[PDB]
Amino acid sequence: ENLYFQSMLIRRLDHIVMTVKSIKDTTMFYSKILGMEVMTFKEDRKALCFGDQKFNLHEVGKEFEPKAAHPVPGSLDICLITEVPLEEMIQHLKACDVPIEEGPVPRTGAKGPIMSIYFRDPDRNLIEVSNY
Amino acid sequence: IRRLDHIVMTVKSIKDTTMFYSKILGMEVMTFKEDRKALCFGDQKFNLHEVGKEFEPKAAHPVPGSLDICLITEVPLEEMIQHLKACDVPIEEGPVPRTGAKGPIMSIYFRDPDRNLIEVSNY
């Protein structure tokens, strides 16, 4: 009954907690490479904002509770949609000397087929940047 | 303009994970590329892979239980709590006031089968 109700109620990701070796290195990378906004909250916390979502950052050895059972840097494999044409994103990554691991390639998005490029962040998380 | 589309979740058992997310959060179990499985919950999804089965490109460390995520629902948190209690899913924390990307949120926390931390919230 409640299973059925939840099946028809839309849900959305608000944020994810990313565990990193260095918050300084990660904030520098996401601000320069993807234009994410570096924000400070609760006086001692950092986040990367984009659109209506964010990444909360935890630094290895400085994690806040509660957290993932296994906070591991480099365990994330995420796909970000951008309205920026993928060709312009490729030009941007080449300019910033960020190697493109794969792409442009066709992939499956949540809402249908997407075009994607892949690259690594400082912790070797896999970042997929895509267009619908 | 940038938005999260999907995340890859590494799991011990696709059967256990799909049953949990379908029952507890009403996620749709979908099959794509003949054998691949995903959990669809709105405009986003979780792609699933069993431990050691995913091919490159993948995360440097595909680890079960490494996720710590927050999902917004329009379902009142009190109704969510009653659903988890009925399904015998322990609520680790909540309802508590927390910080969302767009402002304050009300949250509950619980573990999935791989002990990922799942925060379910309301704006």
3-state secondary structure A53-96: EEEEEEECCCCCCCCCCCCCCCCCEEEEECCCCHHHHHHHHHHC
Q: Which of residues 110-129 of A touch B (CB under 8 A)?
A: 110-111, 114, 118, 120, 123-126
Q: Is residue A8 in some structural domain?
A: no
Of A13, A15, A14, A12, nearest in space to A56 by CA:
A15
Q: Residue A5 falls within a domain, yes or no?
A: no
Would you state the structure tokens that stand for residue A57, as one six-digit string?
Answer: 């950052």
Give B48-52 contacts, CB < 8 A, sequence gap 24+: B48/B8, B48/B9, B48/B11, B48/B14, B48/B17, B48/B18, B49/B8, B49/B9, B49/B10, B49/B11, B50/B10, B50/B11, B50/B12, B50/B13, B50/B14, B51/B10, B51/B11, B51/B12
What lies within 8 Å, CB to CB, of B90 at 6+ separation is B84, B110, B111
- Whether residue B3 contacts residue B101, with contact meaning beta carbons closer than 8 Å, is answered with no
The residues near B22 (Cβ < 8 Å, ≥ 6 apart) are A3, A7, B28, B29, B39
Q: Cα distance from A23 to chain B (closest Cα, Å)?
A: 17
What is the rounded distance in angstroms from the CA atom of residue B33 to the CA atom of residue A113? Answer: 12
Where residue B86 sits, what CATH number does that domain have?
A: 3.10.180.10
In the numeric block, the tokens 């909360």 are attached to A56
Residue A38 domain-assigned? yes
Which technique?
X-ray
Radius of gyration of chain A (CA): 16
Q: CB-hemisphere CA count at 13 Å for A37?
A: 12
Reading the block at residue B110, the tokens are 């619980």
With tokens 């994810």, the residue in question is A16
Residue numbers of the domain that contains B29: 5-123
Asked if residues B74 and B118 have their Cβ atoms less than 8 Å apart, the reply is no
Q: How far apart are CA B12 and CA B113, in angstroms?
A: 8
Q: Which of A14, A123, A126 sits opposite B57 (nearest CB)?
A: A126
Is the Cα torsion angle A62, A67, A72, A78 positive or negative in sign? Answer: negative
Residue of A114, A118, A91 whose CA lies nearest to A102: A118
Phi, psi of B83 (to 5 degrees): -65, -50
Total structural domains within chain A: 1
- Eight-class DSSP state of B65: T
> Residue A5 and residue B75: Cα distance in Å, rounded?
9
Question: Can you name the residues that pair with A45 across neighbouring β-strands?
Answer: A41
Query: Cα separation of A84 and A91, whole Å?
Result: 11
- Decide if A128 is catalytic: yes
Contact B3 A51 (CB under 8 A): yes
The single residue listed with the structure tokens 């591991």 is: A72
* Backbone discontinuities in chain B, residue before each (C to N > 2.5 A): none
A2 within domain boundaries: no
Query: Which of B23, B102, B117 faces A3 most closely, judged by CB atoms?
Result: B23
